[PDB]
Design a protein around this motif. Sequence first.
Motif, PDB file in Angstrom:
ATOM      1  N   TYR A 279      -9.541 -49.356  34.085  1.00 34.54           N
ATOM      2  CA  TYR A 279     -10.374 -47.730  32.229  1.00 34.54           C
ATOM      3  C   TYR A 279     -11.747 -47.659  33.120  1.00 34.54           C
ATOM      4  O   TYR A 279     -12.477 -47.229  31.539  1.00 34.54           O
ATOM      5  CB  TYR A 279     -10.401 -48.258  31.375  1.00 34.54           C
ATOM      6  CG  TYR A 279      -9.230 -47.613  30.509  1.00 34.54           C
ATOM      7  CD1 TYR A 279      -7.648 -46.746  30.423  1.00 34.54           C
ATOM      8  CD2 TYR A 279      -8.011 -49.065  30.354  1.00 34.54           C
ATOM      9  CE1 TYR A 279      -6.650 -46.435  30.349  1.00 34.54           C
ATOM     10  CE2 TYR A 279      -6.218 -48.939  30.471  1.00 34.54           C
ATOM     11  CZ  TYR A 279      -5.930 -47.028  30.270  1.00 34.54           C
ATOM     12  OH  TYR A 279      -4.848 -47.438  29.535  1.00 34.54           O
ATOM     13  N   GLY A 280     -11.933 -47.691  34.151  1.00 33.41           N
ATOM     14  CA  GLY A 280     -13.386 -47.926  34.852  1.00 33.41           C
ATOM     15  C   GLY A 280     -14.264 -48.390  34.309  1.00 33.41           C
ATOM     16  O   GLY A 280     -15.445 -48.019  33.857  1.00 33.41           O
ATOM     17  N   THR A 281     -14.093 -49.475  33.215  1.00 33.11           N
ATOM     18  CA  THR A 281     -14.915 -50.668  32.988  1.00 33.11           C
ATOM     19  C   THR A 281     -15.750 -51.308  33.667  1.00 33.11           C
ATOM     20  O   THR A 281     -15.415 -51.447  34.738  1.00 33.11           O
ATOM     21  CB  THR A 281     -13.670 -51.443  32.146  1.00 33.11           C
ATOM     22  OG1 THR A 281     -13.106 -50.732  30.871  1.00 33.11           O
ATOM     23  CG2 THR A 281     -14.790 -52.843  31.605  1.00 33.11           C
ATOM     24  N   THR A 282     -17.451 -50.747  33.111  1.00 28.23           N
ATOM     25  CA  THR A 282     -18.113 -51.498  33.825  1.00 28.23           C
ATOM     26  C   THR A 282     -19.204 -51.966  33.436  1.00 28.23           C
ATOM     27  O   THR A 282     -20.460 -51.625  32.277  1.00 28.23           O
ATOM     28  CB  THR A 282     -19.123 -49.862  34.663  1.00 28.23           C
ATOM     29  OG1 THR A 282     -17.649 -48.799  35.251  1.00 28.23           O
ATOM     30  CG2 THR A 282     -19.972 -50.299  35.816  1.00 28.23           C
ATOM     31  N   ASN A 283     -19.789 -53.264  33.095  1.00 32.73           N
ATOM     32  CA  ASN A 283     -20.730 -53.665  32.105  1.00 32.73           C
ATOM     33  C   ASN A 283     -20.945 -54.261  33.694  1.00 32.73           C
ATOM     34  O   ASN A 283     -21.645 -55.131  34.598  1.00 32.73           O
ATOM     35  CB  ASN A 283     -19.343 -55.107  31.885  1.00 32.73           C
ATOM     36  CG  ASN A 283     -18.463 -54.391  31.367  1.00 32.73           C
ATOM     37  OD1 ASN A 283     -18.370 -53.490  30.490  1.00 32.73           O
ATOM     38  ND2 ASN A 283     -17.270 -55.263  31.178  1.00 32.73           N
ATOM     39  N   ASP A 284     -22.675 -55.356  32.789  1.00 36.17           N
ATOM     40  CA  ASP A 284     -23.273 -56.098  32.659  1.00 36.17           C
ATOM     41  C   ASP A 284     -24.510 -56.294  31.796  1.00 36.17           C
ATOM     42  O   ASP A 284     -24.361 -55.755  30.802  1.00 36.17           O
ATOM     43  CB  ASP A 284     -24.765 -55.244  33.929  1.00 36.17           C
ATOM     44  CG  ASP A 284     -25.687 -55.839  34.837  1.00 36.17           C
ATOM     45  OD1 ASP A 284     -25.020 -57.109  35.519  1.00 36.17           O
ATOM     46  OD2 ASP A 284     -26.413 -55.263  35.860  1.00 36.17           O
ATOM     47  N   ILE A 285     -24.728 -58.137  32.307  1.00 33.30           N
ATOM     48  CA  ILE A 285     -25.644 -58.639  30.954  1.00 33.30           C
ATOM     49  C   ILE A 285     -26.649 -59.342  32.057  1.00 33.30           C
ATOM     50  O   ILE A 285     -26.530 -59.701  32.824  1.00 33.30           O
ATOM     51  CB  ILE A 285     -24.460 -59.982  30.249  1.00 33.30           C
ATOM     52  CG1 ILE A 285     -24.408 -60.263  30.984  1.00 33.30           C
ATOM     53  CG2 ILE A 285     -23.609 -58.658  29.541  1.00 33.30           C
ATOM     54  CD1 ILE A 285     -23.609 -61.369  30.350  1.00 33.30           C
ATOM     55  N   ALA A 286     -27.720 -59.445  31.339  1.00 38.87           N
ATOM     56  CA  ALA A 286     -28.841 -60.026  31.888  1.00 38.87           C
ATOM     57  C   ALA A 286     -30.025 -59.811  31.181  1.00 38.87           C
ATOM     58  O   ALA A 286     -29.980 -59.651  30.158  1.00 38.87           O
ATOM     59  CB  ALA A 286     -29.079 -58.047  32.363  1.00 38.87           C
ATOM     60  N   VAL A 287     -30.633 -61.166  31.961  1.00 40.14           N
ATOM     61  CA  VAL A 287     -31.924 -61.589  31.109  1.00 40.14           C
ATOM     62  C   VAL A 287     -33.279 -60.524  32.283  1.00 40.14           C
ATOM     63  O   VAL A 287     -32.910 -61.420  33.490  1.00 40.14           O
ATOM     64  CB  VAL A 287     -32.255 -63.312  31.358  1.00 40.14           C
ATOM     65  CG1 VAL A 287     -32.865 -63.467  30.310  1.00 40.14           C
ATOM     66  CG2 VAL A 287     -30.937 -63.613  30.856  1.00 40.14           C
ATOM     67  N   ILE A 288     -34.172 -60.482  31.299  1.00 44.82           N
ATOM     68  CA  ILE A 288     -35.132 -60.113  32.671  1.00 44.82           C
ATOM     69  C   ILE A 288     -35.994 -60.668  31.905  1.00 44.82           C
ATOM     70  O   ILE A 288     -36.901 -60.672  30.638  1.00 44.82           O
ATOM     71  CB  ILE A 288     -34.992 -58.752  31.915  1.00 44.82           C
ATOM     72  CG1 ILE A 288     -33.682 -57.996  31.843  1.00 44.82           C
ATOM     73  CG2 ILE A 288     -36.212 -57.406  32.722  1.00 44.82           C
ATOM     74  CD1 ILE A 288     -33.040 -56.521  31.555  1.00 44.82           C
ATOM     75  N   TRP A 289     -37.194 -61.130  32.913  1.00 47.62           N
ATOM     76  CA  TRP A 289     -38.449 -61.418  32.865  1.00 47.62           C
ATOM     77  C   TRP A 289     -39.713 -60.215  33.471  1.00 47.62           C
ATOM     78  O   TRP A 289     -39.662 -60.205  34.159  1.00 47.62           O
ATOM     79  CB  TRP A 289     -38.635 -62.890  33.536  1.00 47.62           C
ATOM     80  CG  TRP A 289     -38.268 -64.193  33.095  1.00 47.62           C
ATOM     81  CD1 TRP A 289     -38.420 -64.825  32.040  1.00 47.62           C
ATOM     82  CD2 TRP A 289     -36.966 -64.150  32.727  1.00 47.62           C
ATOM     83  NE1 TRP A 289     -37.405 -65.926  31.849  1.00 47.62           N
ATOM     84  CE2 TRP A 289     -36.567 -65.333  32.607  1.00 47.62           C
ATOM     85  CE3 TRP A 289     -35.645 -63.598  33.984  1.00 47.62           C
ATOM     86  CZ2 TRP A 289     -35.129 -66.072  33.039  1.00 47.62           C
ATOM     87  CZ3 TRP A 289     -34.226 -64.429  34.432  1.00 47.62           C
ATOM     88  CH2 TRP A 289     -33.671 -65.022  34.111  1.00 47.62           C
ATOM     89  N   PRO A 290     -39.904 -59.420  32.464  1.00 47.29           N
ATOM     90  CA  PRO A 290     -41.208 -58.783  32.965  1.00 47.29           C
ATOM     91  C   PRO A 290     -42.810 -59.394  33.115  1.00 47.29           C
ATOM     92  O   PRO A 290     -42.609 -60.599  32.614  1.00 47.29           O
ATOM     93  CB  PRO A 290     -40.912 -57.613  31.541  1.00 47.29           C
ATOM     94  CG  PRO A 290     -39.911 -58.164  30.995  1.00 47.29           C
ATOM     95  CD  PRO A 290     -40.166 -59.474  31.334  1.00 47.29           C
ATOM     96  N   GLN A 291     -42.856 -59.202  33.662  1.00 49.09           N
ATOM     97  CA  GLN A 291     -44.649 -60.177  34.285  1.00 49.09           C
ATOM     98  C   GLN A 291     -45.456 -59.772  33.255  1.00 49.09           C
ATOM     99  O   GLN A 291     -45.613 -59.087  32.459  1.00 49.09           O
ATOM    100  CB  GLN A 291     -45.141 -59.777  35.288  1.00 49.09           C
ATOM    101  CG  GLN A 291     -44.118 -58.896  36.409  1.00 49.09           C
ATOM    102  CD  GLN A 291     -44.762 -59.447  38.113  1.00 49.09           C
ATOM    103  OE1 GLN A 291     -45.899 -59.716  38.237  1.00 49.09           O
ATOM    104  NE2 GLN A 291     -43.682 -59.164  39.250  1.00 49.09           N
TER     105      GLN A 291
END
Length: 261
Positions: free
Chosen positions: A213-225
Amino acid sequence: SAVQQKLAALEKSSGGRLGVALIDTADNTQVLYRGDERFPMCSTSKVMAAAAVLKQSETQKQLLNQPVEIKPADLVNYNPIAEKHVNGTMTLAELSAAALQYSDNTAMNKLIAQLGGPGGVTAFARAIGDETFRLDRTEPTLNTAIPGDPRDTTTPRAMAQTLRQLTLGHALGETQRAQLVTWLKGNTTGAASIRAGLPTSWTVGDKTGSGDYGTTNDIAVIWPQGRAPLVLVTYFTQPQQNAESRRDVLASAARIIAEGL
């Protein structure tokens, strides 16, 4: 809100269903779009299996060095790393890295087996306070992503809170948390997803997922400066069983979020 209007516009332009949850650890503020709807997790579930094995290693101090046999019968549909070790062994650490950084499906099944089945992965989620996550199947059938099917789903809100606890909180011991963070930062599959919508300067650790079903996922932790970390979950699925992946939708959602800092 302006961000919610732009996310709704993005969803409308895309033809699918988009779920987003952001946690800003600076003030513990949250941005949600379809935050309490269920989405198929696909490979984003691999983070939970790896974290559950890390939790076991708090008491079994050499568990990660334990060799596990890779046999021809163990190979499933996508095994970039396990294929290189058929008729040999990989340690649980190597299998965890392969599941996370290359999305290896044989590695995921070995982690599930070490936990005593999908119910052992779900149990770990419950033990850390996630009452929404459910893992019901192994690879590759957990990726069927059938509309309305609750198997192998979570919500954006729940996965954002859990990912925060695992990586920035204290759901795991100190060495285990640092190892999970190191693995996530070294992911190889995420260049076109959340990372592509964010300043090249920010450090990201992420786990992608894709399925039918075109499933497209991402889970992220992000460290901006010079700024507190953020946790960002983006789930996307489409109405046609054979739809193409849309990693660009995830990049665009991240860009909209980042605009609002």
